[PDB]
Amino acid sequence: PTIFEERHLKYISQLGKGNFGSVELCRYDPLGDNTGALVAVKQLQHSGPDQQRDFQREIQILKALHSDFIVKYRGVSYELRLVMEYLPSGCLRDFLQRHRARLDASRLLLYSSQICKGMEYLGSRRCVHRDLAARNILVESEAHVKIADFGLAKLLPLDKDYYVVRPIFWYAPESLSDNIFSRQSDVWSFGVVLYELFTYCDKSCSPSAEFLRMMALCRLLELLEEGQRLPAPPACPAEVHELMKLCWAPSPQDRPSFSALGPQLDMLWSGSR
Numbered sequence: 001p002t003i004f005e006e007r008h009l010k011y012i013s014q015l016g017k018g019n020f021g022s023v024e025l026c027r028y029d030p031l032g033d034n035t036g037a038l039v040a041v042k043q044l045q046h047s048g049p050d051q052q053r054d055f056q057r058e059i060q061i062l063k064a065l066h067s068d069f070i071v072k073y074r075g076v077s078y079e080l081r082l083v084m085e086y087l088p089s090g091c092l093r094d095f096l097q098r099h100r101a102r103l104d105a106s107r108l109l110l111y112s113s114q115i116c117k118g119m120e121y122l123g124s125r126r127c128v129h130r131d132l133a134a135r136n137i138l139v140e141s142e143a144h145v146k147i148a149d150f151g152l153a154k155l156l157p158l159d160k161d162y163y164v165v166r167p168i169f170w171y172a173p174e175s176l177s178d179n180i181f182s183r184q185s186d187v188w189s190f191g192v193v194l195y196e197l198f199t200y201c202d203k204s205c206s207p208s209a210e211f212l213r214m215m216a217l218c219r220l221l222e223l224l225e226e227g228q229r230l231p232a233p234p235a236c237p238a239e240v241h242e243l244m245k246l247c248w249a250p251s252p253q254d255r256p257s258f259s260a261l262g263p264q265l266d267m268l269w270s271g272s273r
């Protein structure tokens with residue numbers, strides 16, 4: 001159903017805990033026979049007027065997005081709760097670190113393509129994610145990934161292609177300097193996600209570790225303005241690194257679209273065999 005009756009939601013475990021609000025594993029079983037489906041349930045803890053309104057926004061955005069690469073909205077529970085599908089393989093950051101020995105360049109290109117397709121759909125719906133990282137991508141299986149956590153997601157103002165809003169290593173220069181967020185700033189974050197994948201989210205050479213080695217917020221902007229970028233991950237295919245470099249173009253209008261990146265990654269995967 002579109003409405004999930006509260007009394008039928010059995011708590012199992014904690015899937016996440018943010019500054020305000022948490023996500024928990026629940027078995028929605030109205031029969032009481034312990035045969036119900038497993039769902040991820042989001043609720044707000046301490047919260048406030050700002051957080052409650054942003055959560056209300058998040059629910060509506062997730063409800064309207066229909067992509068095989070964006071976490072599925074299931075319904076609501078009324079003390080509002082957001083009910084979503086349960087991806088049992090955890091987040092992509094955890095997955096790569098755990099399965100590094102098995103995952104080859106072809107599989108990383110598959111994820112890259114999937115995140116790109118989802119990111120493209122998101123853009124067509126005039127939506128900006130604002131927090132695109134490997135920790136915010138969820139794993140369905142070894143061959144399927146989905147974009148999650150739309151808590152920071154903002155819908156573009158009807159008369160503009162950017163939003164100014166009042167984890168900085170994934171943020172574009174225009175974002176750090178003028179707090180500007182566009183579909184083009186999401187492209188910059190995608191380039192970092194691409195780096196995260198071909199490093200298998202290694203802590204030693206993570207975007208945080210590499211940038212701190214290269215140089216607190218003005219110091220990072222200084223580097224990006226100077227042309228300083230993340231190094232080409234070890235054994236990373238040349239063409240993938242060239243796409244990362246293009247996603248990291250200083251001017252947002254010079255960055256490729258997700259519509260342009262999509263086929264370029266898809267044709268690279270075909271080359272991997």
Ligand SMILES: */C=C\C(=O)Nc1cccc(CNc2nc(Nc3ccc(N4CCN(C)CC4)cc3OC)ncc2Cl)c1
Binds near residue numbers: 071088089090
């Ligand atoms: C990368 C850490 C993380 O927890 N990320 C993350 C991103 C987006 C959304 C969520 C929570 N929502 C959610 N979660 C799942 N499944 C899921 C996610 C994360 C974990 N963890 C891995 C191990 N560890 C205990 C920390 C958290 C587990 C699982 O379930 C297996 N499915 C759907 C949704 Cl909406 C979390």
